[PDB]
């Protein structure tokens, strides 16, 4: 309850045949459904109105908290400051009018995933490469482990997603903040995500790197993501 935004310390060197990660050691994708105002006087009119996502401004919140090198981080050397958060990081966001659609891929198909996680069902050796059986909706917060799931480029017709993975022992975190940067969400046809049932879906994973305790134990550190989505009224044909 004190280390909100951290994982349980990382286990290492599990046999591929005996790999049973703790639930609290596994970062999961974040998701929220944002209710939007009803636009429709009625649902009988020839044309109806739907919210259309046009742009998103987004950034990671609290990046300067990593300038705390006094709280619990291993000294870099004798008399030195604490070790910065560093190592493998993943920065991902999606905006859609439907839940994010995901494809399952595993490091280890024999991993025994714990209760409270949703992971690829009936995994095979093919699950370590591409097994098209592993399709999920990001339909639950704090459930889909980041290590099991990626955004599915074969689907997500009504979602725009953006991710960067930087892997490595000592990878430096590099994070930008500005309220002047906008990502356009309109497709080739000039249409943004259309918000079905007056619902906007925001999804994120922001693993900033590993925190190192004085012992050498490592914990994932995550930070919140802000979304500001510009929406416009789009006329559609009444499907009823």
């Amino acid at each position: 309850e004190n280390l909100r935004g951290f994982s349980l310390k990382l286990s290492a060197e599990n046999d591929f045949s005996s790999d049973s990660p703790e639930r609290k050691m596994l970062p999961c994708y974040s998701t929220a459904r944002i209710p939007l105002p009803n636009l429709n006087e009625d649902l009988t009119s020839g044309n109806l109105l739907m919210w259309e996502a046009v742009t998103v401004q987004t950034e990671v919140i609290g990046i300067t908290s990593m300038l705390n090198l006094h709280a619990g981080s291993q000294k870099v050397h004798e008399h030195g400051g604490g070790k910065p958060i560093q190592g493998s990081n993943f920065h991902f966001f999606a905006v859609g009018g439907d839940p994010l659609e995901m494809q399952g891929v595993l490091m280890n198909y024999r991993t025994k995933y714990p209760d409270g996680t949703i992971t690829p069902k009936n995994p095979t050796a093919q699950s370590q490469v591409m097994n098209t059986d592993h399709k999920a909706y990001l339909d639950k917060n704090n459930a889909y482990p980041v290590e099991c799931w990626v955004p599915d480029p074969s689907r997500n017709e009504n979602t725009r997603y953006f991710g960067t993975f930087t892997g490595g022992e000592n990878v430096p975190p590099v994070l930008h903040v500005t309220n002047t940067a906008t990502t356009v969400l309109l497709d080739e046809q000039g249409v943004g995500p259309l918000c079905k049932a007056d619902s906007l879906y925001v999804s994120a994973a922001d693993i900033c790197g590993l925190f190192t305790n004085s012992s050498g134990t490592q914990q994932w550190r995550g930070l919140a993501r802000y979304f500001k989505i510009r929406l416009r009224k789009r006329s559609v044909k009444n499907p009823y």
Partner: antibody
Amino acid sequence: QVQLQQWGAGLLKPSETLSLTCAVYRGSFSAYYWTWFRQPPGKGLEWIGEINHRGYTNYNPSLRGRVSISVDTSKKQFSLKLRSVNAADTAVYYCATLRSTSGWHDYFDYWGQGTLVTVSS
Amino acid sequence: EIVLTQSPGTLSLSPGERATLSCRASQSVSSSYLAWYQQTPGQAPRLLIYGASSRATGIPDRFSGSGSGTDFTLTISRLEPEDFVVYFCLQYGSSPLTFGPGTKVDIKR
């Protein structure tokens, strides 16, 4: 792979002072809180107290006044002193660390082999 | 000091069965700072669970903990022969650290 090596006189006479030392190998001496426990024959465990590398101590009131814990950073050793021993101090004494200096979130399970301490004339 | 009580004193169960062990505190354990230890005769205590529900390095997944405040549970999902030994709870939410008096798990025959 932190290794705790425990030594000291296990056979004590009533009224004497118990003196035990724990040596730390294959681990950072400065990175952990160093703790003493005892387990009387066929009974549960008692927390005696703890120390860090800077010599900050906390003791159980249950044997307070009688107990001293010290560190030797040059030898990477910490010690237990228990004054005026009697039959009720008969126990297996364990040195251990339960957590790093980062705090209780960074929990550990390193134990010495234990010293059987018998108090008898 | 915080007093811990363990129930039952002796738990008699068969290999392969689910074991549920209880630890109750005289007052609320701060931050759910409750650890579970296994003790085999002639050995130091062995950590299973810390922070009420965190499994320790290298501990098999059949060991799990739950609870908060005053009420804590260790679950052994499927008892192996080596599991029929003594279990202690430790609270470290309050100084001094205090242990429960222990639960013995014995093979029901």
